[PDB]
Every structure is written in structure tokens, then in C-alpha cells.
Amino acid sequence: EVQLVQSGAEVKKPGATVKISCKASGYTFSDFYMYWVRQAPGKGLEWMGLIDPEDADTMYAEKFRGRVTITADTSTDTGYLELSSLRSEDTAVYYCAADPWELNAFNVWGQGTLVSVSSASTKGPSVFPLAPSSKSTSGGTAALGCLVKDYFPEPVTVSWNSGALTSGVHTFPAVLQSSGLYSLSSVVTVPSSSLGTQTYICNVNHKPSNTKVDKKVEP
């Protein structure tokens, strides 16, 4: 019954300001605090602040005091989080949370909102081959893959032979380069005996830019 629904993913330039919303349903919004938490990719949870919807009284984590503003609209059961002077380090999934049953814990959580901050603009990736060779062969097995380079923002999905190939597939977390663009690799290990007969194609999909790439990888 109770649920928190946040706004969609966002992309911003450094120095800009972002403001996200969280719609509460299933309980009396103004009667309880609303908390905000964030989490950088692969990192831990970090409490940012809280607000009393009724009187707009707020409390912020020491490291965010000055750049963050938490507000709420009891007319629409919606709370908001605004963060200014955005830095690339502010790239993360932001969550809202509530404790409708006063258990003194974050009982209900929104689905989260990804905010990606970079000087780069939405861009599709270039897909390069990671060709199988004597330097990627182990016994009767060979490794091959695709290098999905220079895209923004996350995420990107990769499949092999349209999903027909899943065994031995490893798609790695993307790394954020100093250029402000991401890069990731996807590899698969197969029987080296199949290299001259079986076709291997990695299907890359970067929805943010509507970019799709099918890359055939040969020895």
C-alpha cells in the first residue's frame, strides 16, 4: 500500500543544479519526516538530510549543508531534493525514504533516481573488437569480446548473438574516464575450435542516445 515514487534519471553539467521529486502514497505524508539518501555507483549509503513536511523544518548532513535544499508540498504529497554546484562526484542514485510506522528506521524506500554529472553530453559508444588470438587462448578455450568505449550516461546493455549466447559471458561494470565518458568491456570464452565456424556478435544498446550497435568479432 505505502510507496515512494521518484522522478526520472537526470544528466547535468558540473556547476549546475538538480532537483528531484518523490511522491508519497499510502500514508499521511505531512505527518512524518521524509529522508534523503544517496549512493555512488558501487559505493555505500550516505544520509543527506530530512524534512518535516508540515513546517518545512529541515536538517542536513554536515557535508551537504550549503549545497542542498529539501522542500515538500503537502498539497501534492510530494517532497523534493535540490542539490547545487554539482560536481562529477555527485553522480549517484538518490533515494527518498520514510518511516510511516515510526520504527526509527528507513522502512520504505523510493526506487531511486540516477543523477549523472559530467561535462560530456549524451553520447553513444564506439564498439571495438577484442579479437581472439594465441594471446587469448587457454587450452581448448578462447576469449573474445567487445570494448564499448566513450558513452554517456549509464547504462548500456550488451548481449551476444541476440541472447543465444550466455554461457561464459562476462559483462563488466563501466569505468568513468577522466574525459567524463564511460567505457566497459564484455567478453565471452568459447571453444577455440569454433572460431573458424561460429559467428560471434555482441549487441550493444545505449538507450539514452538511442544507439544500437552489432559488432561481429573475428580472430
Binding site: Y35, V37, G44, L45, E46, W47, L50, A61, Y95, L103, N104, A105, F106, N107, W109, G110, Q111, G112, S126, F128, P129, L130, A131, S133, K135, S136, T137, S138, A143, G145, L147, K149, H170, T171, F172, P173, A174, V175, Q177, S183, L184, S185, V187, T189
Partner: protein
Amino acid sequence: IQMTQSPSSVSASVGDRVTITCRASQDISTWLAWYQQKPGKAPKLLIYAASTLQSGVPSRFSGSGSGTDFSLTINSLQPEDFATYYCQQANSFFTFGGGTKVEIKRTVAAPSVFIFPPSDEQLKSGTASVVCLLNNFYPREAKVQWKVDNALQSGNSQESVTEQDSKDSTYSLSSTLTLSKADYEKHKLYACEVTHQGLSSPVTKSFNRGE
């Protein structure tokens, strides 16, 4: 207002009894909560008030402690329990601990190492990315050292590791060394030296440009 969780990672098997700890820098009575989180999902409340089990959460979960020392215990670990766990001060503030990941235990396995030179395609664009792959190893800790004409490279490579494999519980690691096309063509030997506790000595995989 400082929450410390150790170990940062713990390995266990289904059926095992697992216990993780959390310590506050100050006395927080029993204002402590525990959460569970899996990749790509929002956290889930497990315990509040240090020992009260959240409604709906399996009784195999329990928590205890007061003051500055706390613990979470999972009696008979189930496959759905492998995840990351966080403690959180609920007293003043709401400081989260750093988290402790519960991973699947298995035997030590050295990585298979492969190296991929840059493609002609990318070189045309003026950049050269060399990729080193460490496949199916355990545990997670591994070290990759890039060397170009025997010069150790530092600051010009990035790496990432997959989540434990679903069938063999191993990890894989991918590292990319990036150089301008000009710098790449100015050197000959490209190598990635790998060290892992499962290897008695470093394993090196390399190629000579124009091999």
C-alpha cells in the same frame, strides 16, 4: 556519529551461520538499524532498535548489542541472503556503516590471463586501448600491473570486477590501458603482470606491437 563495519567482506556457504559486526564511535543505546541491499535494488530494512526483526523478515535473521558494539547474525544462510548489509545509527543523525558484503565461499582459484591489443579501427581515431582480462579467479583481490617496454604504467589504466559468477562463484576482472596513438606507436612491448594469492609468482601476458 561514525559507524564501522568489519570485515568489509565475508565468505560463507548456504546453511552456514554468519555474523557481522558494527561499531559506533559513540554510545547510541539501541538506536541501530540493519539493512540488506543487492545490486540494482533499493535497501531493505531487516532490523530496527538493534534487535527487533522487521515484520516479514525471516526469523533466521537476528540482531543484538547496545552502546557501541552491535552484530547481525544469519543462522542458516540461504542463497537469497548473499548481499551487502549496512548498519545505521538511528539516534541523532542517521549515519550508515560502510557495509559488509556476504559472498559465496569456494576454493582459491588463480585467474586465466588474456591480453588484447588495440584494434586497427580505434587506432585510426587516434587512441589505443590495451585490454587485460583475468578470468574466473577467487578470491576477489587481484593486482594488475601494466608495463610498456618494461616501464610500469600508473594512472593511465582503469579496471572493474564482475559480481560472483552464478555457476562457479568466481570473479573476473577487466583492465584497460589507454594511450594516444602516437605514444602507442613509440613503444614495442606491451604486457600485463598479474599477481593473485592463488599464483606462486606473477603471471605475465604480453605482445610486441606489430607482432
